[PDB]
Amino acid sequence: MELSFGARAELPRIHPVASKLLRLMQKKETNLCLSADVSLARELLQLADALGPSICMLKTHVDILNDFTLDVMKELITLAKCHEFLIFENRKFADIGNTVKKQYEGGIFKIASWADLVNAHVVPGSGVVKGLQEVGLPLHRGCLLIAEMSSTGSLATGDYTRAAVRMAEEHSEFVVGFISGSRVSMKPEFLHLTPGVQLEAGGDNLGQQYNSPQEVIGKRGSDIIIVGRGIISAADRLEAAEMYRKAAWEAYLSRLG
Amino acid sequence: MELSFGARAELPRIHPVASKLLRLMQKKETNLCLSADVSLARELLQLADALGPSICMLKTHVDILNDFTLDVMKELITLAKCHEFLIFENRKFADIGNTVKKQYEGGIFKIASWADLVNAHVVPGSGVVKGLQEVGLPLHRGCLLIAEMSSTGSLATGDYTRAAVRMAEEHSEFVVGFISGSRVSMKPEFLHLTPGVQLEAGGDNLGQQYNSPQEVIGKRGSDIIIVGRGIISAADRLEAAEMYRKAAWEAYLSRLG
Numbered sequence: 147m148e149l150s151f152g153a154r155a156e157l158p159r160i161h162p163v164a165s166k167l168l169r170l171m172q173k174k175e176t177n178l179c180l181s182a183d184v185s186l187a188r189e190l191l192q193l194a195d196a197l198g199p200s201i202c203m204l205k206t207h208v209d210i211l212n213d214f215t216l217d218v219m220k221e222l223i224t225l226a227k228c229h230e231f232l233i234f235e236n237r238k239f240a241d242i243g244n245t246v247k248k249q250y251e252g253g254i255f256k257i258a259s260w261a262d263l264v265n266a267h268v269v270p271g272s273g274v275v276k277g278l279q280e281v282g283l284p285l286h287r288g289c290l291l292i293a294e295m296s297s298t299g300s301l302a303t304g305d306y307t308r309a310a311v312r313m314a315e316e317h318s319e320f321v322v323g324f325i326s327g328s329r330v331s332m333k334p335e336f337l338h339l340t341p342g343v344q345l346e347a348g349g350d351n352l353g354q355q356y357n358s359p360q361e362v363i364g365k366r367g368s369d370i371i372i373v374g375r376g377i378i379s380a381a382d383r384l385e386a387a388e389m390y391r392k393a394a395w396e397a398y399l400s401r402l403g
Numbered sequence: 404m405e406l407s408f409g410a411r412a413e414l415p416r417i418h419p420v421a422s423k424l425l426r427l428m429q430k431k432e433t434n435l436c437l438s439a440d441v442s443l444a445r446e447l448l449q450l451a452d453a454l455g456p457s458i459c460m461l462k463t464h465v466d467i468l469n470d471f472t473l474d475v476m477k478e479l480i481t482l483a484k485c486h487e488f489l490i491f492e493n494r495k496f497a498d499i500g501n502t503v504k505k506q507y508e509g510g511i512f513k514i515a516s517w518a519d520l521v522n523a524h525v526v527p528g529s530g531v532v533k534g535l536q537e538v539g540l541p542l543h544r545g546c547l548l549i550a551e552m553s554s555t556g557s558l559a560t561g562d563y564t565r566a567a568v569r570m571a572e573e574h575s576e577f578v579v580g581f582i583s584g585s586r587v588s589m590k591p592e593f594l595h596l597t598p599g600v601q602l603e604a605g606g607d608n609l610g611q612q613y614n615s616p617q618e619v620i621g622k623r624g625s626d627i628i629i630v631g632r633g634i635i636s637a638a639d640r641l642e643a644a645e646m647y648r649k650a651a652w653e654a655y656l657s658r659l660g
């Protein structure tokens with residue numbers, strides 16, 4: 147009952163942004179999302195260009211980009227179109243509906259204007275989704291709900307995770323998936339993206355816990371690995387990205403049969 | 404026995420930021436925080452100056468400020484020092500430790516460089532606090548933990564709320580209190596700040612729910628009301644600020660005896 151990414155792109159209830167992503171995943175043989183956790187535009191753009199062919203998605207961190215401008219994002223969009231990847235902004239929206247609407251659409255960042263995908267916490271209740279949707283729906287954007295977190299002590303467990311899944315189901319015109327550590331929905335229209343991924347066992351000094359691509363994709367049933375430091379800290383970020391891409395792709399192929 | 408704000412300001416285990424806030428609350432007879440939910444610097448600085456005398460705190464929304472610069476924040480600080488109120492940035496930090504550290508210190512906004520107070524969601528586990536504290540402690544800052552939310556379908560209930568209180572207790576060198584709808588800790592060194600406050604019954608059309616100053620300060624035992632639209636959308640903003648200040652203050656006096 148496992149389907150390829152390319153077949154999932156054709157599912158009757160699939161959102162257009164999800165279909166676009168699934169098609170490029172299949173085309174490029176990648177289910178790797180780069181977490182571009184860097185402070186300078188030059189580095190962001192150079193990683194985007196060099197690793198573009200290896201990734202299905204680049205996760206931006208505009209709240210840490212010391213030299214953000216909208217022109218930087220225009221250049222990133224050019225690279226995304228060229229190399230074929232989606233732009234996912236990291237910011238974990240987590241406020242009442244009316245607030246997150248403005249945080250998404252406006253300020254200096256104007257996130258909705260350039261991000262294909264955003265993510266939201268479900269702790270406020272579904273108003274968080276509803277607010278983001280008022281902005282992103284006509285822009286053909288999608289949203290991921292944070293159903294589980296990778297960090298030590300995470301409270302996104304049990305009934306909380308179930309609430310996230312229900313909320314996604316009830317807002318499928320805009321919610322395209324989850325940030326989670328494993329498959330949390332049985333519905334194949336939903337994407338599972340998993341951060342906290344490295345080839346080596348370990349964690350960091352501030353509560354991050356790591357699992358491998360083979361574990362996350364192969365055994366836990368997620369779709370896409372989100373990798374920051376496992377790539378960013380490497381001497382050769384391109385080689386690192388290729389190792390992560392192969393790991394995640396081959397784990398996916400093995401669950402297909 | 405309930406202590407006055409002035410007496411709480413002198414408690415041996417009080418955090419310096421909380422002491423500063425409690426002293427000016429007592430001095431100015433105000434336990435009102437203005438939520439400065441505006442898009443333009445001119446509007447933020449106008450409200451800060453006009454309403455400064457009536458408030459103990461101004462909650463900024465830098466993620467919606469279309470013309471943010473550091474010079475705007477220098478000028479806001481000058482108003483805060485003149486009128487005597489603290490600056491509390493709204494952004495509900497909600498990510499792993501390593502990420503929120505950078506979101507707090509860096510980017511274009513450099514929140515730690517001008518906000519007295521920040522707030523965090525507890526969903527990621529205690530790393531969210533550890534990460535923020537690594538930046539906030541050197542900068543003499545404080546943090547509030549979001550123990551309850553004002554919105555419909557909030558998951559910040561029960562064991563989640565209890566987890567927030569334990570996290571605060573264990574990080575009392577940085578955490579000075581809570582965003583909550585009610586008193587959640589019995590320790591008088593912690594502040595309670597409550598959003599979703601208006602004089603009349605109701606909500607917004609994106610899940611916000613409202614309670615009155617008398618209910619939240621008097622019956623529910625909170626310390627400070629956070630008010631945005633109840634003031635900002637009024638014809639006469641100074642009069643509205645004064646109505647909320649008087650309401651919150653009298654509720655406090657009555658609980659005190």
Ligand SMILES: *c1cc(=O)[nH]c(=O)n1[C@@H]1O[C@H](COP(=O)(O)O)[C@@H](O)[C@H]1O
Pocket residue numbers: 181183236294295296297325341342343354372373374375376498499502
């Ligand atoms: C988001 C949600 C979550 O549960 N765990 C996370 O780590 N994140 C974000 O993903 C990235 C992890 O990066 P790294 O540990 O691979 O360097 C990071 O951007 C974090 O905010």
Ligand SMILES: [Cl-]
Pocket residue numbers: 553598599
């Ligand atoms: Cl709030």
